[PDB]
Amino acid sequence: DTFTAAVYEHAAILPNATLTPVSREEALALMNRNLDILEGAITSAADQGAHIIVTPEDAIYGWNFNRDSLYPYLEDIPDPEVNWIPCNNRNRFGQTPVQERLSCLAKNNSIYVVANIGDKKPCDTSDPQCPPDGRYQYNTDVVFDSQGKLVARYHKQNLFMGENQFNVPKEPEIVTFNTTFGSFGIFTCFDILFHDPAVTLVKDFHVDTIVFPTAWMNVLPHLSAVEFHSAWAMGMRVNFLASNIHYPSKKMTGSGIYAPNSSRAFHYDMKTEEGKLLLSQLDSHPSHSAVVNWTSYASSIEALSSGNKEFKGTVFFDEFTFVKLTGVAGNYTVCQKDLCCHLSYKMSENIPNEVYALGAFDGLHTVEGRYYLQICTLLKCKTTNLNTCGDSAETASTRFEMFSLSGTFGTQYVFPEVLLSENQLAPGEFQVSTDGRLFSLKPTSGPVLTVTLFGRLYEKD
Numbered sequence: 001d002t003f004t005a006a007v008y009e010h011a012a013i014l015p016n017a018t019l020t021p022v023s024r025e026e027a028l029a030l031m032n033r034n035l036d037i038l039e040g041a042i043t044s045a046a047d048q049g050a051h052i053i054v055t056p057e058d059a060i061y062g063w064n065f066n067r068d069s070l071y072p073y074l075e076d077i078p079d080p081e082v083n084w085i086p087c088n089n090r091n092r093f094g095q096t097p098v099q100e101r102l103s104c105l106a107k108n109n110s111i112y113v114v115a116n117i118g119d120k121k122p123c124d125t126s127d128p129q130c131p132p133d134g135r136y137q138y139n140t141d142v143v144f145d146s147q148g149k150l151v152a153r154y155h156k157q158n159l160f161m162g163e164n165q166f167n168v169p170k171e172p173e174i175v176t177f178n179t180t181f182g183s184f185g186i187f188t189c190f191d192i193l194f195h196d197p198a199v200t201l202v203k204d205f206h207v208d209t210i211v212f213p214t215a216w217m218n219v220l221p222h223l224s225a226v227e228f229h230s231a232w233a234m235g236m237r238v239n240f241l242a243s244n245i246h247y248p249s250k251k252m253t254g255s256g257i258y259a260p261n262s263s264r265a266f267h268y269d270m271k272t273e274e275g276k277l278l279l280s281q282l283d284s285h286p287s288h289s290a291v292v293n294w295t296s297y298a299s300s301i302e303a304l305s306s307g308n309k310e311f312k313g314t315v316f317f318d319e320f321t322f323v324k325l326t327g328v329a330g331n332y333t334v335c336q337k338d339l340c341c342h343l344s345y346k347m348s349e350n351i352p353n354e355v356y357a358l359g360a361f362d363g364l365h366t367v368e369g370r371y372y373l374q375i376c377t378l379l380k381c382k383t384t385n386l387n388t389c390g391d392s393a394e395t396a397s398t399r400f401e402m403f404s405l406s407g408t409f410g411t412q413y414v415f416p417e418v419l420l421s422e423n424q425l426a427p428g429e430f431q432v433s434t435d436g437r438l439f440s441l442k443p444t445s446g447p448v449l450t451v452t453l454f455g456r457l458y459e460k461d
């Protein structure tokens, strides 16, 4: 059994903003301007045979808000158990025009629709956890099945820096929906960097596929959307539908359809202002059985290089211990604290004025979010100057005939990243071994920007 997956990257119409909160009518008009565009993508996807379509986080109202300015955009989204088709019973829960339209879009096009909107939950001064505002406001994913029925509601657990317009639920919501084309899990944006609910859906609830509305700000060399989201799908052995906001001025671009084996379709564009609809086939029940011990090989072998010239380099405000790669071929080992990284490589030719380095990082990230990292990276240094290794580099000229990366990871959550010039994925030019080695299967189709083993130690957060 297979199915056709669709994702839409959306150039959103943002509200004029801000000062005084708009009226419901002004809020609704903006939301309908965005919905008219999403309607175009949903209908085409459905006409092209897609069983499900994911639309981005904040796609209907954007991201510039405080609690009071956000309020007029919010609807009380009921509990999915309530058994409701808003397209067939429009006023069951009072004034709900957005839910009604999303329900009709899914129903009239006979397709599952995943969208991100805002939930309002009025509360009284009685419960202590109730805000002085008189309500809870949540960043909410809604899922409508092919008949227009609300089948899932997910309130984002992991809020980002300055997302002050929203609340966090007391307990993480582990939201799943079952279909004739697999079991589906859902989470949003920054959730992909945490354990709850992301890891739990995969490891405990055994979902086949994740639907992921995102409004992702790209941070090279490891946290470009297409790169990290496909790495997480590969590391977690799950299908993954990433639907992102298109806003190049904020480095927002990178939607795709990912399988456990490799990427299946992807989109990156920093040049145009246009959205993009992607479609691709996937297995309904892929194999999740291909287990990897990430420290196996690396903890068995001895250092591949001795007494080398090592230097400190900054990668996304994190201080990595690096080792320059000298020669068209080599074997290097570099360590930082409990982590030892090993690389075996051979370039297609040595390109002049292009420096590559092997980096190790074992520590806590703190800038704009706290999370514990263990990273082994083969990266293209931005320039020939070693103090530029770990800086955001978008192009490279060095292809590689072979690579084999590994590390002494103190975690089972390691995401394998392969990123080519210019922010292009490499399907299926690489594989991961049961030993925890990220290695090439052919010479790379294009020049390499990075080959990384991105590990998360959730317990040390």
Ligand SMILES: *[C@@H]1O[C@H](CO)[C@@H](O[C@@H]2O[C@H](CO)[C@@H](O[C@@H]3O[C@H](CO[C@@H]4O[C@H](CO)[C@@H](O)[C@H](O[C@@H]5O[C@H](CO)[C@@H](O)[C@H](O)[C@@H]5O)[C@@H]4O)[C@@H](O)[C@H](O[C@@H]4O[C@H](CO)[C@@H](O)[C@H](O)[C@@H]4O)[C@@H]3O)[C@H](O)[C@H]2NC(C)=O)[C@H](O)[C@H]1NC(C)=O
Pocket: 178, 179, 180, 183, 285, 286
């Ligand atoms: C989400 O929805 C899914 C889909 O509906 C639910 O999964 C279904 O659960 C049913 C109940 O447990 C399963 O029914 C039993 O099936 C076996 C036959 O084995 C299957 O053969 C199928 C046809 O070839 C095949 O689709 C199926 O799935 C595959 O399983 C293999 C592993 O073997 C895996 O590799 C694949 O990826 C895929 O999952 C199996 O191979 C029957 O023997 C069994 O017996 C009957 O019991 C009935 C009573 O329940 C009775 O009517 C009858 O007389 C027999 O005694 C059941 O019919 C069904 O296989 C399974 N489908 C899939 C695709 O998983 C899932 O439970 C839902 N989850 C939640 C949380 O709600």
Ligand SMILES: *[C@@H]1O[C@H](CO)[C@@H](O[C@@H]2O[C@H](CO)[C@@H](O[C@@H]3O[C@H](CO)[C@@H](O)[C@H](O)[C@@H]3O)[C@H](O)[C@H]2NC(C)=O)[C@H](O)[C@H]1NC(C)=O
Pocket: 293, 294, 295, 296, 299
């Ligand atoms: C993944 O592979 C590694 C390597 O085999 C596994 O880690 C190893 O786990 C064993 C336990 O089975 C550890 O042994 C212990 O050694 C210490 C002394 O050093 C002591 O407490 C005991 O003598 C015990 O035998 C071993 O040290 C450890 N190695 C490392 C580097 O952590 C790992 O658990 C495997 N995981 C799976 C699920 O396959």
Ligand SMILES: C[C@H](Nc1ncc(C(=O)N2CCC3(CCOCC3)C2)cn1)c1cnccn1
Pocket: 063, 159, 160, 161, 163, 189, 190, 215, 216, 217, 218, 219, 223, 224, 367, 368, 369
């Ligand atoms: C690389 C990664 N990118 C990232 N992380 C998180 C969010 C996120 O959750 N957003 C939610 C809505 C959003 C609020 C800010 O304005 C825009 C819309 C962005 C977006 N991009 C990252 C991680 N840690 C620090 C910095 N960046």
Ligand SMILES: *[C@@H]1O[C@H](CO)[C@@H](O)[C@H](O)[C@H]1NC(C)=O
Pocket: 101, 104, 105, 108
């Ligand atoms: C869906 O169809 C119903 C009638 O079939 C119609 O009233 C409604 O406007 C349609 N909605 C959309 C957004 O297609």
Ligand SMILES: *[C@@H]1O[C@H](CO)[C@@H](O)[C@H](O)[C@H]1NC(C)=O
Pocket: 329, 330, 331, 344
């Ligand atoms: C790297 O290691 C492999 C395996 O030991 C070896 O075949 C290869 O020649 C080495 N290359 C260099 C340049 O050290």
